Every structure is written in C-alpha cells, then in structure tokens.
Scaffold this active site. Structure first.
Site, PDB file in Angstrom:
ATOM      1  N   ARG A   1       6.230   5.711   4.551  1.00  0.00           N
ATOM      2  CA  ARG A   1       5.230   6.088   5.652  1.00  0.00           C
ATOM      3  C   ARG A   1       4.899   7.511   5.596  1.00  0.00           C
ATOM      4  O   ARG A   1       5.896   8.346   5.351  1.00  0.00           O
ATOM      5  CB  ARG A   1       5.609   5.646   6.977  1.00  0.00           C
TER       6      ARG A   1
ATOM      7  N   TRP B   1      15.725 -11.641  18.598  1.00  0.00           N
ATOM      8  CA  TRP B   1      15.366 -12.127  20.007  1.00  0.00           C
ATOM      9  C   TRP B   1      15.502 -13.376  20.097  1.00  0.00           C
ATOM     10  O   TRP B   1      15.223 -13.987  21.362  1.00  0.00           O
ATOM     11  CB  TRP B   1      13.797 -11.474  20.303  1.00  0.00           C
TER      12      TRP B   1
ATOM     13  N   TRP C   1      15.664  -9.248   5.586  1.00  0.00           N
ATOM     14  CA  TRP C   1      14.832  -7.989   5.771  1.00  0.00           C
ATOM     15  C   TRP C   1      15.412  -6.869   4.674  1.00  0.00           C
ATOM     16  O   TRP C   1      16.584  -6.775   4.361  1.00  0.00           O
ATOM     17  CB  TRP C   1      15.016  -7.340   6.966  1.00  0.00           C
TER      18      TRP C   1
ATOM     19  N   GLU D   1       1.986  -7.441  15.274  1.00  0.00           N
ATOM     20  CA  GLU D   1       2.945  -8.350  15.844  1.00  0.00           C
ATOM     21  C   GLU D   1       2.653  -8.725  17.560  1.00  0.00           C
ATOM     22  O   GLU D   1       2.934  -9.765  18.046  1.00  0.00           O
ATOM     23  CB  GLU D   1       4.476  -7.878  15.822  1.00  0.00           C
TER      24      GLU D   1
ATOM     25  N   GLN E   1      11.738 -14.350  15.413  1.00  0.00           N
ATOM     26  CA  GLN E   1      12.416 -13.027  14.932  1.00  0.00           C
ATOM     27  C   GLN E   1      13.782 -13.177  15.251  1.00  0.00           C
ATOM     28  O   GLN E   1      14.418 -13.484  16.375  1.00  0.00           O
ATOM     29  CB  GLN E   1      11.607 -11.918  15.982  1.00  0.00           C
TER      30      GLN E   1
ATOM     31  N   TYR F   1      11.410   4.334   6.212  1.00  0.00           N
ATOM     32  CA  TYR F   1      10.213   4.841   6.696  1.00  0.00           C
ATOM     33  C   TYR F   1       9.903   6.548   6.357  1.00  0.00           C
ATOM     34  O   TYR F   1       8.788   6.894   6.078  1.00  0.00           O
ATOM     35  CB  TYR F   1      10.052   4.831   8.242  1.00  0.00           C
TER      36      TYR F   1
ATOM     37  N   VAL G   1       0.710  -1.143   0.092  1.00  0.00           N
ATOM     38  CA  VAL G   1      -0.094   0.037   0.045  1.00  0.00           C
ATOM     39  C   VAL G   1       0.789   1.393  -0.038  1.00  0.00           C
ATOM     40  O   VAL G   1       1.893   1.312   0.821  1.00  0.00           O
ATOM     41  CB  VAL G   1      -1.022   0.023   1.199  1.00  0.00           C
TER      42      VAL G   1
ATOM     43  N   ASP H   1       8.587  -6.063   2.758  1.00  0.00           N
ATOM     44  CA  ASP H   1       9.775  -5.421   2.821  1.00  0.00           C
ATOM     45  C   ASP H   1      10.847  -6.314   3.241  1.00  0.00           C
ATOM     46  O   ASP H   1      11.599  -6.069   3.835  1.00  0.00           O
ATOM     47  CB  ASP H   1       9.593  -4.389   4.038  1.00  0.00           C
TER      48      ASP H   1
ATOM     49  N   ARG I   1       3.963   3.818  -1.102  1.00  0.00           N
ATOM     50  CA  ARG I   1       5.087   3.588  -2.004  1.00  0.00           C
ATOM     51  C   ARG I   1       5.946   2.385  -1.573  1.00  0.00           C
ATOM     52  O   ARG I   1       7.053   2.046  -2.149  1.00  0.00           O
ATOM     53  CB  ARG I   1       6.123   5.096  -1.612  1.00  0.00           C
TER      54      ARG I   1
ATOM     55  N   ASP J   1       5.181 -10.109   4.923  1.00  0.00           N
ATOM     56  CA  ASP J   1       5.549  -8.682   4.615  1.00  0.00           C
ATOM     57  C   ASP J   1       6.278  -8.394   3.553  1.00  0.00           C
ATOM     58  O   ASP J   1       6.871  -9.417   3.027  1.00  0.00           O
ATOM     59  CB  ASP J   1       6.493  -8.224   5.600  1.00  0.00           C
TER      60      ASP J   1
ATOM     61  N   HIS K   1       8.098 -13.214  14.679  1.00  0.00           N
ATOM     62  CA  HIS K   1       7.903 -12.027  13.794  1.00  0.00           C
ATOM     63  C   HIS K   1       6.727 -12.056  12.932  1.00  0.00           C
ATOM     64  O   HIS K   1       6.154 -13.066  12.623  1.00  0.00           O
ATOM     65  CB  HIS K   1       9.160 -12.375  13.045  1.00  0.00           C
TER      66      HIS K   1
ATOM     67  N   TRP L   1       3.758  -3.087  19.198  1.00  0.00           N
ATOM     68  CA  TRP L   1       4.165  -3.406  18.102  1.00  0.00           C
ATOM     69  C   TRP L   1       3.058  -4.043  16.966  1.00  0.00           C
ATOM     70  O   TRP L   1       3.055  -5.095  16.310  1.00  0.00           O
ATOM     71  CB  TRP L   1       5.075  -4.659  18.319  1.00  0.00           C
TER      72      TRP L   1
HETATM   73  O1  UDP Z   1       2.167   1.828   4.776  1.00  0.00           O
HETATM   74  C1  UDP Z   1       1.896   0.854   4.814  1.00  0.00           C
HETATM   75  C2  UDP Z   1       2.487  -0.038   5.799  1.00  0.00           C
HETATM   76  C3  UDP Z   1       2.472  -1.275   5.904  1.00  0.00           C
HETATM   77  N1  UDP Z   1       2.359  -1.831   4.550  1.00  0.00           N
HETATM   78  C4  UDP Z   1       2.345  -3.485   4.705  1.00  0.00           C
HETATM   79  O2  UDP Z   1       2.455  -4.174   6.045  1.00  0.00           O
HETATM   80  C5  UDP Z   1       3.742  -4.683   6.146  1.00  0.00           C
HETATM   81  C6  UDP Z   1       4.121  -4.432   7.733  1.00  0.00           C
HETATM   82  O3  UDP Z   1       4.762  -3.262   7.777  1.00  0.00           O
HETATM   83  P1  UDP Z   1       6.241  -2.843   7.905  1.00  0.00           P
HETATM   84  O4  UDP Z   1       6.880  -3.815   6.739  1.00  0.00           O
HETATM   85  O5  UDP Z   1       6.456  -1.420   7.219  1.00  0.00           O
HETATM   86  O6  UDP Z   1       6.617  -3.140   9.214  1.00  0.00           O
HETATM   87  P2  UDP Z   1       8.360  -3.429   9.903  1.00  0.00           P
HETATM   88  O7  UDP Z   1       8.817  -4.833   9.428  1.00  0.00           O
HETATM   89  O8  UDP Z   1       9.028  -2.456   9.364  1.00  0.00           O
HETATM   90  O9  UDP Z   1       8.038  -3.132  11.409  1.00  0.00           O
HETATM   91  C7  UDP Z   1       4.564  -4.094   5.295  1.00  0.00           C
HETATM   92  O10 UDP Z   1       5.659  -5.158   4.926  1.00  0.00           O
HETATM   93  C8  UDP Z   1       3.632  -4.032   4.097  1.00  0.00           C
HETATM   94  O11 UDP Z   1       3.374  -5.335   3.689  1.00  0.00           O
HETATM   95  C9  UDP Z   1       2.133  -1.277   3.322  1.00  0.00           C
HETATM   96  O12 UDP Z   1       2.074  -2.100   2.476  1.00  0.00           O
HETATM   97  N2  UDP Z   1       2.032  -0.102   3.603  1.00  0.00           N
HETATM   98 MN    MN Z   2       8.453  -5.539   7.463  1.00  0.00          MN
END
Ligand code: UDP
Ligand code: MN
Length: 287
Positions: free
Chosen positions: A284, A169, A275, A236, A166, A280, A55, A146, A57, A144, A199, A233
């Site tokens: 975000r 930890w 990862w 999570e 995760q 961000y 969702v 990312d 960028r 996820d 995780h 979190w």
């Molecule tokens: O603006 C948003 C925030 C979250 N995500 C989705 O939700 C997952 C969890 O968020 P994020 O990966 O940013 O959390 P982090 O692993 O960085 O704590 C992301 O990998 C994406 O799949 C997204 O698509 N857009």
């Molecule tokens: Mn993530």
C-alpha cells in the site's frame, strides 16, 4: 431441483452453527456431499467464474500464488474462467493452467487510495457482469488476491448468494462485530441488529445476484462519498449491510477463509483457503 438434504447434513457438525434462522446452510467440513453435487452440476454443464483484482505490488506479492492455487483447488472437475483485473498487464504472471481452466485479463485504472482500489471493485465487477460474465457462467465468486487456496473449494459452495463467515468473529455476539456504527453511513448497522460478520474477501452467487450485491454496495460507497464519510471497513462494511438486508442463501464456514495467525482450533477441520500475511508497508502507498 436439488434439495438441501440431498447434499447437506448438519448433524455431522453438531458443535457449530449449520443452519441460519432463515434456513440457509452454513457449510462446514463434513456436512457436504460433494459427489452428489459434482454429478448434479456436471449434468447441467455449469461453468463457474472467479474475479480477482491485483493493483500495484499486490500483483508481484500475491497474484501468482492465488492463481496457481485456484487452478489446483477451485471447482475441480467443472469448467472455470478466471477473470483477472490488473493495472499493468505487463506484470501479469502467466501460469500454466490445468484441465477445464481458462482465463482472461483486463487492464483497469489504478485508483489513488488503496481504500478506493478495494471499494471500486464493486463498480468494476458489475460492469463486467453486464458486459460478459452473465453470458459466460452460472455462478461467480469474487475474491481478494491476498489469500491462497489450500484444499478443494468445490461445488458445495455454490448458491444464489453466498457469504463468507469471517474467521475472527464467527463465534462472537453481533454487538462485538465491527460493523459500521455511524448512522451517517449507508453501511450503518445499529447495535442490536445483525446475524453474522461476513468477510469481504469472498462472496458469490449467480451473476444476477452478484450484480445486485455489487451494485447496492457501490451505491452505498458513492452515497458516503457525497456525505463526506468513509465506512470503517470500506467495502466490507457495505457488504455486511447488504447481507443484513438481503440474506445470503448460503454461508461458508471460516474453514473456507481461515487466518492461521489464530492457530487451528477444534472447529477448523480442513482449511480450504488461508489468508496471506499482511505486507501493507510494501503493497500500500497511502495510510
Ligand atoms: O492497493 C490495492 C489494495 C487492494 N487491492 C485488492 O483489493 C483486495 C482488498 O484489499 P486487502 O486485501 O488489502 O484488504 P485486507 O483483506 O488486507 O483488509 C486485495 O486483496 C486486492 O485484490 C489491490 O489489488 N491493490
Ligand atoms: Mn484481503
């Protein structure tokens, strides 16, 4: 009627945790017999699903690399369906897929807060399970975007309910885990309790089990909203509470979801997924 010892040998990795007290395996490189498993699952003609959300960028930053790497490395040799949830289908990177991969794309509503984008996945996944995934696959992973697959992520990871250790930890004591510690939250886990810190970037199971995971997590998320609290979190925290109560029948070592910022210590023998660096400030739009 596969038996654990048919495919899993904990003695191959004597220096790490390979079995839980509720006798679920922790799958580390070296402990699994993938050939045994590929044969077994091919004889049952399984299909494996994978949901991923992108969702905003996150689409441009991560979705292509995710899907390209999933194509190459996820459940190779078995049919796979990628379910891609985006807020703008017009930005979907439409890569070439290989044998036994196919996909479909859905347009979803972008939540305003990134926190809610992440948490609303729980609701959306369940909706999709009920409407179609339950009819399409034998097992489903929810991931996820990312992150990037780095090597084979195969049928050794399949099970009724599958959790990811995760990376930061896995050797820690539970009282150091970053569980939600406020009793006002549905995600609360008291000091003195806890098995592992899981995780939320990877979880899975059969569609039935994943429906229960996601439904119970979203109930918690909604309850917190009514109580004007938001877990530290987010999804999570809720996932960890879920898996405390409903223990996973399989756990994946941090090899399956590794943070190279840590380096590469002795215990991480072959990385299957890594990862992506966080971005961000770009991906975000709220704090
Ligand atoms: O603006 C948003 C925030 C979250 N995500 C989705 O939700 C997952 C969890 O968020 P994020 O990966 O940013 O959390 P982090 O692993 O960085 O704590 C992301 O990998 C994406 O799949 C997204 O698509 N857009
Ligand atoms: Mn993530």
């Amino acid at each position: 009627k596969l038996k654990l010892s048919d495919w899993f040998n904990p003695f191959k990795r004597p220096e790490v945790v390979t079995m839980t007290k509720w006798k679920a395996p922790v799958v580390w490189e070296g402990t699994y017999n993938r050939a045994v498993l590929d044969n077994y699952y091919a004889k049952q003609k399984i299909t494996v699903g994978l949901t991923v959300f992108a969702v905003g960028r996150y689409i441009e930053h991560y979705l292509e690399e995710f899907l390209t790497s999933a194509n190459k490395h996820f459940m190779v040799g078995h049919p796979v369906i990628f379910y891609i949830m985006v807020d703008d289908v017009s930005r979907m990177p439409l890569i070439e897929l290989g044998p036994l991969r196919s996909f479909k794309v859905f347009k979803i509503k972008p939540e305003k807060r990134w926190q809610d984008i992440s948490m609303m996945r729980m609701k959306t996944i369940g909706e999709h399970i009920v409407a179609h995934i339950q009819h399409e696959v034998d097992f489903l992973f929810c991931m996820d975007v990312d992150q990037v697959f780095q090597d084979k992520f195969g049928v050794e990871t399949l099970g009724e309910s599958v959790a990811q250790l995760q990376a930061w930890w896995y050797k820690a004591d539970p009282n150091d885990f970053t569980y939600e510690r406020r009793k006002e939250s549905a995600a609360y886990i008291p000091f003195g309790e806890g098995d592992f810190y899981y995780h939320a970037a990877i979880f899975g199971g059969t569609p039935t089990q994943v429906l229960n995971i996601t439904q119970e997590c979203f109930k918690g998320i909604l309850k917190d909203k009514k109580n004007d609290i938001e877990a530290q979190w987010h999804d999570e925290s809720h996932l960890n509470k879920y898996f405390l109560l409903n223990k996973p029948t399989k756990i994946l070592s941090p090899e399956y979801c590794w943070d190279y910022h840590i380096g590469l210590p002795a215990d991480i023998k072959l990385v299957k997924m890594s990862w992506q660096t966080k971005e961000y400030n770009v991906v975000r739009n709220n704090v």
